[PDB]
Amino acid sequence: SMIKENVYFDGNVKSLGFSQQDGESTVGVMAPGQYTFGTGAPERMTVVKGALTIKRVTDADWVTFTAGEAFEVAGNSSFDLQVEVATAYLCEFLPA
Amino acid sequence: MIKENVYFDGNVKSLGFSQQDGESTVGVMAPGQYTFGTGAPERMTVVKGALTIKRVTDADWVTFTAGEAFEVAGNSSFDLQVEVATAYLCEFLP
User: Fold this and answer.
1) Which of A7, A51, B26, B65 is 20 to 30 A from A18, comparing alpha carbons?
2) Dist CA B72 CA B42 (whole Å)
3) Domain that holds residue B88
4) Do the chains contact at A28 and B15, CB–CB below 8 Å?
């Protein structure tokens, strides 16, 4: 209700959605593995602990984002992630 | 791999995960006021939002905003006031 749990990829990605006055954000964990996700709205992912190695439509090569780094994903798109250690992240909509 | 825990009638939820340095958690606290106990000392980092806390050593409530971190003594307890839903990272100290 207040905090929405989502489970993806047979339990290898889990997230908690929460709302502030400007709307919803999510914090989640990805277990080691390789995943694909689609986007609706563009979004900003911040690595909280661990690292995400990603390939978006604009990336000629895979790019590793470590803790404290943030990347954006285009709207209505998709991207791949490689996870070598269980990694926590924050996911937000872009400012309007 | 990823252990979900739920507390306080759904007002606190956490996801526990292990790296080579051991276990860490990320979680969310919905607006409200909570008391938590500790075993090992803990380091809590505010990911988004803010936590206003009172530990045994705090004469007054202390507010930590996004990016800021605080430590809680081992084998202790502390109170939190949450005014907006707040995400946090919780780690062991050593």
Assistant:
1) A51
2) 5
3) 1-94
4) yes
Number of domains in chain B: 1
Tokens describing residue A95? 């400012």
- Spatial strand order of the sheet with B50-54 comes to B32-37, B77-82, B50-54, B62-65
Q: Which long-range contacts (CB under 8 A, 24 or more apart) does B22-26 make?
A: B22/B92, B23/B92, B24/A49, B24/A88, B24/B89, B24/B90, B24/B91, B24/B92, B25/B89, B25/B90, B25/B91, B26/A16, B26/A27, B26/A28, B26/A29, B26/A48, B26/A49, B26/A88, B26/B87, B26/B88, B26/B89, B26/B90
Q: How far apart are CA B10 and CA A40, in angstroms?
A: 28
Enter the tokens of residue A44: 């900003």
To probe the interface with B, which of A49, A52, A87 has the most B CB atoms within 10 Å?
Answer: A49
Question: Do you know the residue count of chain A?
Answer: 96
How was this one solved? X-ray
Instruction: Pick A2's closest partner by Cβ from B2, B11, B26.
Output: B11
- Whether the CB-CB separation of B25 and B9 falls below 8 Å is answered with no
Q: Residue A1 and residue A76: Cα distance in Å, rounded? A: 27
Q: Report yes or no: A72 and A47 within 8 Å, Cβ to Cβ.
A: no
